[PDB]
Curated annotation (Swiss-Prot):
Function, in words: The function of this hydrophobic plant seed protein is not known.
Disulfide bridges in this chain: C3-C40, C4-C32, C16-C26
UniProt keyword list: Disulfide bond, Plant defense, Secreted
GO cellular component terms attached to this protein's record: extracellular region
Protein name: Crambin
Amino acid sequence: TTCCPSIVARSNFNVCRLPGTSEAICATYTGCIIIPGATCPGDYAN
């Protein structure tokens, strides 16, 4: 599951994914995170 810190970061993440970039690279690129669960925390609400 991916969780993002802000709207901007999520929008950025989704563009990063368009060419097929791994989620892990898009995460460090944007400040989004990958978690094994499905429940994003309050400070990664977007």
